[PDB]
Scaffold this active site. Sequence first.
Site, PDB file in Angstrom:
ATOM      1  N   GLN A  58     -25.879 -16.759 -26.355  1.00 17.64           N
ATOM      2  CA  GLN A  58     -24.928 -17.808 -25.939  1.00 17.64           C
ATOM      3  C   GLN A  58     -24.883 -18.095 -24.436  1.00 17.64           C
ATOM      4  O   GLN A  58     -24.380 -19.138 -24.027  1.00 17.64           O
ATOM      5  CB  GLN A  58     -23.525 -17.475 -26.444  1.00 17.64           C
ATOM      6  CG  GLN A  58     -22.870 -16.287 -25.775  1.00 17.64           C
ATOM      7  CD  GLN A  58     -21.528 -15.986 -26.382  1.00 17.64           C
ATOM      8  OE1 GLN A  58     -21.425 -15.331 -27.418  1.00 17.64           O
ATOM      9  NE2 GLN A  58     -20.483 -16.488 -25.736  1.00 17.64           N
ATOM     10  N   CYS A 103     -18.852 -18.010 -28.323  1.00 13.20           N
ATOM     11  CA  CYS A 103     -19.001 -16.981 -29.369  1.00 13.20           C
ATOM     12  C   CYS A 103     -18.521 -17.496 -30.723  1.00 13.20           C
ATOM     13  O   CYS A 103     -19.185 -17.330 -31.745  1.00 13.20           O
ATOM     14  CB  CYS A 103     -18.231 -15.718 -28.992  1.00 13.20           C
ATOM     15  SG  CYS A 103     -16.487 -15.970 -28.619  1.00 13.20           S
ATOM     16  N   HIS A 142     -13.557 -11.641 -28.912  1.00 18.96           N
ATOM     17  CA  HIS A 142     -14.960 -11.968 -29.171  1.00 18.96           C
ATOM     18  C   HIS A 142     -15.089 -12.305 -30.648  1.00 18.96           C
ATOM     19  O   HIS A 142     -14.322 -11.783 -31.458  1.00 18.96           O
ATOM     20  CB  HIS A 142     -15.870 -10.803 -28.771  1.00 18.96           C
ATOM     21  CG  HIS A 142     -17.339 -11.131 -28.786  1.00 18.96           C
ATOM     22  ND1 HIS A 142     -17.827 -12.379 -28.482  1.00 18.96           N
ATOM     23  CD2 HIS A 142     -18.426 -10.351 -29.019  1.00 18.96           C
ATOM     24  CE1 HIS A 142     -19.145 -12.368 -28.561  1.00 18.96           C
ATOM     25  NE2 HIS A 142     -19.536 -11.147 -28.881  1.00 18.96           N
ATOM     26  N   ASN A 146     -24.397  -9.950 -33.090  1.00 18.13           N
ATOM     27  CA  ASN A 146     -23.819 -10.491 -31.887  1.00 18.13           C
ATOM     28  C   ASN A 146     -24.637 -11.738 -31.481  1.00 18.13           C
ATOM     29  O   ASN A 146     -25.622 -12.105 -32.150  1.00 18.13           O
ATOM     30  CB  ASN A 146     -23.786  -9.405 -30.794  1.00 18.13           C
ATOM     31  CG  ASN A 146     -22.682  -9.603 -29.779  1.00 18.13           C
ATOM     32  OD1 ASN A 146     -22.146 -10.698 -29.632  1.00 18.13           O
ATOM     33  ND2 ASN A 146     -22.366  -8.536 -29.021  1.00 18.13           N
TER      34      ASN A 146
HETATM   35  C1  LIG Z   1     -16.183 -15.971 -26.764  1.00 17.64           C
HETATM   36  O1  LIG Z   1     -17.428 -16.497 -26.294  1.00 17.64           O
HETATM   37  C2  LIG Z   1     -16.029 -14.573 -26.214  1.00 17.64           C
HETATM   38  O2  LIG Z   1     -15.521 -14.752 -24.887  1.00 17.64           O
HETATM   39  C3  LIG Z   1     -14.869 -16.022 -24.751  1.00 17.64           C
HETATM   40  C4  LIG Z   1     -13.386 -15.853 -24.525  1.00 17.64           C
HETATM   41  C5  LIG Z   1     -13.015 -14.933 -23.432  1.00 17.64           C
HETATM   42  C6  LIG Z   1     -12.717 -14.201 -22.554  1.00 17.64           C
HETATM   43  C7  LIG Z   1     -12.894 -15.512 -25.921  1.00 17.64           C
HETATM   44  N1  LIG Z   1     -13.684 -16.426 -26.753  1.00 17.64           N
HETATM   45  C8  LIG Z   1     -13.289 -17.076 -27.860  1.00 17.64           C
HETATM   46  O3  LIG Z   1     -13.867 -18.073 -28.268  1.00 17.64           O
HETATM   47  C9  LIG Z   1     -12.080 -16.651 -28.657  1.00 17.64           C
HETATM   48  C10 LIG Z   1     -12.548 -16.168 -30.018  1.00 17.64           C
HETATM   49  C11 LIG Z   1     -11.457 -15.613 -30.918  1.00 17.64           C
HETATM   50  C12 LIG Z   1     -11.846 -15.763 -32.385  1.00 17.64           C
HETATM   51  C13 LIG Z   1     -11.170 -14.157 -30.571  1.00 17.64           C
HETATM   52  N2  LIG Z   1     -11.184 -17.783 -28.805  1.00 17.64           N
HETATM   53  C14 LIG Z   1     -10.472 -18.307 -27.790  1.00 17.64           C
HETATM   54  O4  LIG Z   1     -10.480 -17.806 -26.674  1.00 17.64           O
HETATM   55  C15 LIG Z   1      -9.793 -19.634 -28.008  1.00 17.64           C
HETATM   56  C16 LIG Z   1      -9.340 -20.008 -29.270  1.00 17.64           C
HETATM   57  C17 LIG Z   1      -8.763 -21.249 -29.469  1.00 17.64           C
HETATM   58  C18 LIG Z   1      -8.601 -22.155 -28.413  1.00 17.64           C
HETATM   59  C19 LIG Z   1      -8.031 -23.516 -28.662  1.00 17.64           C
HETATM   60  N3  LIG Z   1      -8.042 -24.436 -27.640  1.00 17.64           N
HETATM   61  C20 LIG Z   1      -7.545 -25.628 -28.054  1.00 17.64           C
HETATM   62  N4  LIG Z   1      -7.437 -26.677 -27.163  1.00 17.64           N
HETATM   63  C21 LIG Z   1      -8.134 -26.669 -25.875  1.00 17.64           C
HETATM   64  C22 LIG Z   1      -7.493 -27.653 -24.903  1.00 17.64           C
HETATM   65  N5  LIG Z   1      -7.519 -28.995 -25.465  1.00 17.64           N
HETATM   66  C23 LIG Z   1      -6.979 -29.970 -24.512  1.00 17.64           C
HETATM   67  C24 LIG Z   1      -6.761 -29.015 -26.708  1.00 17.64           C
HETATM   68  C25 LIG Z   1      -7.335 -28.033 -27.715  1.00 17.64           C
HETATM   69  S1  LIG Z   1      -7.106 -25.674 -29.716  1.00 17.64           S
HETATM   70  C26 LIG Z   1      -7.586 -24.034 -29.873  1.00 17.64           C
HETATM   71  F1  LIG Z   1      -7.474 -23.411 -31.104  1.00 17.64           F
HETATM   72  C27 LIG Z   1      -9.066 -21.785 -27.146  1.00 17.64           C
HETATM   73  C28 LIG Z   1      -9.654 -20.533 -26.946  1.00 17.64           C
HETATM   74  C29 LIG Z   1     -15.000 -16.672 -26.111  1.00 17.64           C
END
Ligand SMILES: *[C@]1(O)CO[C@@H]2[C@H](C#C)CN(C(=O)[C@H](CC(C)C)NC(=O)c3ccc(-c4nc(N5CCN(C)CC5)sc4F)cc3)[C@@H]21
Length: 217
Positions: free
Chosen positions: A21, A27, A164, A184
């Site tokens: 990635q 992730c 993650h 991963n």
């Molecule tokens: C992965 O790549 C691992 O590292 C990074 C982050 C760090 C540090 C954590 N990560 C994630 O993707 C997590 C994964 C979960 C399953 C543990 N998720 C989030 O960090 C995350 C989930 C949901 C949102 C979210 N944003 C929304 N917005 C954004 C702004 N926009 C204007 C409106 C919508 S809706 C929503 F559900 C953000 C982050 C990665």
Amino acid sequence: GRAPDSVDYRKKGYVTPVKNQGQCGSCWAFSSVGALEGQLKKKTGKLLNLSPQNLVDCVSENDGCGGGYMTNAFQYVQKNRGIDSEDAYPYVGQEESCMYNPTGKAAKCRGYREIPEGNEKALKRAVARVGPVSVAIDASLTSFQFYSKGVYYDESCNSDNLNHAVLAVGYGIQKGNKHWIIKNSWGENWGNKGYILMARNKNNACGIANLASFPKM
Ligand SMILES: *[C@]1(O)CO[C@@H]2[C@H](C#C)CN(C(=O)[C@H](CC(C)C)NC(=O)c3ccc(-c4nc(N5CCN(C)CC5)sc4F)cc3)[C@@H]21
């Protein structure tokens, strides 16, 4: 009916090669495509790379390289009536304008199911019945990040700190230590050829069963 003692969907041709990635917080998108790739193989007999970039760019209820949820990704594919192949919509590792093209559609989604929170037995049964399952974990410990071999367990892991998203491709045992087989998205040079064995039935270690889901197709 009890599920098999061990299952490895890599052996069944359900799992594409390990991806990298890069710096983008995508992730969640790799987790989601992995689960979709498994179901696509089960449906069509063909193993194909699906597009995480399609998800990064087009899932408006998520945050692109700032993170997302897998369930939101499945909802998008369902609403959108498709997801593109990797070849039709390649990974670039930064958020760009949504350029989904229905002619490159390689899979659809009818919805998703969530594993009951914290239930490792239900996760095991789902992996056995369905295929690879998207999971969230605490990967914050340097002990996780420096993993090379064995079955990973660290008492400092926090099941409430989901940071993650990865893919459970099977489960089994090694030197008597029950495990989950985890793909991963940190490249093949990470871990054991991109994989980690994580402790199974050790009180939901690292939150493995706290936010697990799979797509239907
Ligand atoms: C992965 O790549 C691992 O590292 C990074 C982050 C760090 C540090 C954590 N990560 C994630 O993707 C997590 C994964 C979960 C399953 C543990 N998720 C989030 O960090 C995350 C989930 C949901 C949102 C979210 N944003 C929304 N917005 C954004 C702004 N926009 C204007 C409106 C919508 S809706 C929503 F559900 C953000 C982050 C990665």
